[PDB]
Amino acid sequence: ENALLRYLLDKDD
Amino acid sequence: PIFLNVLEAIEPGVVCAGHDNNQPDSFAALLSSLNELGERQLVHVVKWAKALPGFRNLHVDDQMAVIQYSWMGLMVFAMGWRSFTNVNSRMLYFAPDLVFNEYRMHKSRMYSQCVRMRHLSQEFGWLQITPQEFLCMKALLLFSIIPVDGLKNQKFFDELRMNYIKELDRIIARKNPTSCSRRFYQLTKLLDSVQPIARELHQFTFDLLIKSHMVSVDFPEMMAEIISVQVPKILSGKVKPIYFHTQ
Ligand SMILES: C[C@]12CC[C@H]3[C@@H](CCC4=CC(=O)CC[C@@]43C)[C@@H]1CC[C@@H]2O
């Protein structure tokens, strides 16, 4: 579970 | 040309490495700058991938997986293209502020790998690869490396990959079948050629991560995690490239 990468995938920005 | 319109529209712009060119070259500074460049480009690869036709219909864990496995190949291929278009493959154009001449290829301790990457760059010239062929090929590289035990929803991945192959074929289609056939053959061979390069770089970066403390090479957050968890799955044979031709 790569949290930072998942965050980039999940964020719209 | 809906598909090409999209790929053109979503294509990332210029990414700088943040390298200080005013300082003399060193293995540590060059590799630390390459690592930071990888982190920066990964951010752009995620934003791009999210915008690719059909990508979001993949299971979210599979989106994560294809990104984590394919980034090296994708980035090498794009760098080969930049090198071709900006400096006719004379040097490796990693970024506007990180252009490798032969001295840097030597100092980086990646000379042989750099040779292969420059050969790749030259192929874009030798084959007269069009900007549109480049875009379709690059998109296909995202869908060219997966676990041997398959993904969470393999069927959706298979369908997506199929459609990206079809779009490449369309962009090649020449009222003479032999011309399109030779061309598809050439471009699939070129795509295959990325994988052994990416694998040598996978080994190099993993070995470097393992000893990074001993050589003063910094690895940013995402790169360090990916290279310690995901890259070993490639090196151990759990995750393998999808080849067109039998190697
Ligand atoms: C992985 C790596 C950092 C990221 C580099 C990679 C070489 C290929 C490459 C080309 C790019 O244009 C982005 C950075 C990357 C993806 C480097 C090889 C060793 C170093 O640790």
For the residues of B119-169, what is the DSSP string, one character each? HHHHHHHHTT--HHHHHHHHHHHTTSEEETT--TTHHHHHHHHHHHHHHHH
Residue of B50, B60, B222 with shortest CB distance to A2 = B222
3-state DSSP call for residue B98?
A: strand
For residue B68, the chain A residues in CB contact (below 8 A) are: 2, 5
For residue A8, the chain B residues in CB contact (below 8 A) are: 43, 46-47
To the nearest 10°, report the CA torsion of B41, B45, B46, B48. 130
Taking CA atoms, B75 is separated from B67, B93, B197, in Å, by 11, 12, 11
Q: Do B43 and A9 touch (CB under 8 A)?
A: no
**What residue ranges line ligand 1, CB within 6 angstroms?**
B 31, 34-35, 37-38, 41, 72, 75-76, 79, 94, 201, 204-205, 208
Q: Pick from B101, B129, B146: which is nearest to B186 by CA?
A: B129
Distance of alpha carbon B141 from alpha carbon B134, whole angstroms: 11
Nearest CA in chain B to A2: B225
Distance of alpha carbon B40 from alpha carbon B16, whole angstroms: 8
For residue B63, the chain A residues in CB contact (below 8 A) are: 9
Bridge partners of B99, per DSSP, are B93
Query: For chain B, how big is the Rg over CA atoms in Å?
Result: 18
For helices B27-50 and B60-87, the axis angle rounded to 10 degrees is 120
Displacement of CA B33 from its chain's centroid (Å) = 17
The Cα of B61 is separated from the nearest Cα of chain A by a number of Å equal to 9
The Cα of A3 is separated from the nearest Cα of chain B by a number of Å equal to 9
Query: For chain A, how big is the Rg over CA atoms in Å?
Result: 7
Sign of torsion, CA B14 B220 B217 B23? positive
DSSP letter, residue B94: E
- One-letter amino acid identity for B85? T
- For residue B41, which atom of ligand 1 is closest to its CA? 13
Question: The tokens 């993904």 sit on which residue?
Answer: B151
Centre a 10 Å sphere on the Cβ of residue A1 and count the other Cβ atoms it contains. Answer: 8
Domains of chain B in start order, with CATH, are 1-247 (1.10.565.10)
- For residue B205, which atom of ligand 1 is closest to its CA? 21
- For residue B201, which atom of ligand 1 is closest to its CA? 18
Distance of alpha carbon B98 from alpha carbon B94, whole angstroms: 6
Residue numbers belonging to the annotated binding site of B for 17beta-hydroxy-5alpha-androstan-3-one:
35, 82, 205
CA B216 to ligand 1 centroid distance, Å = 17
Q: Which two tokens stand for residue B161?
A: 């990959």
For residue A4, the chain B residues in CB contact (below 8 A) are: 221-222, 225
Distance of alpha carbon B201 from alpha carbon B17, whole angstroms: 18
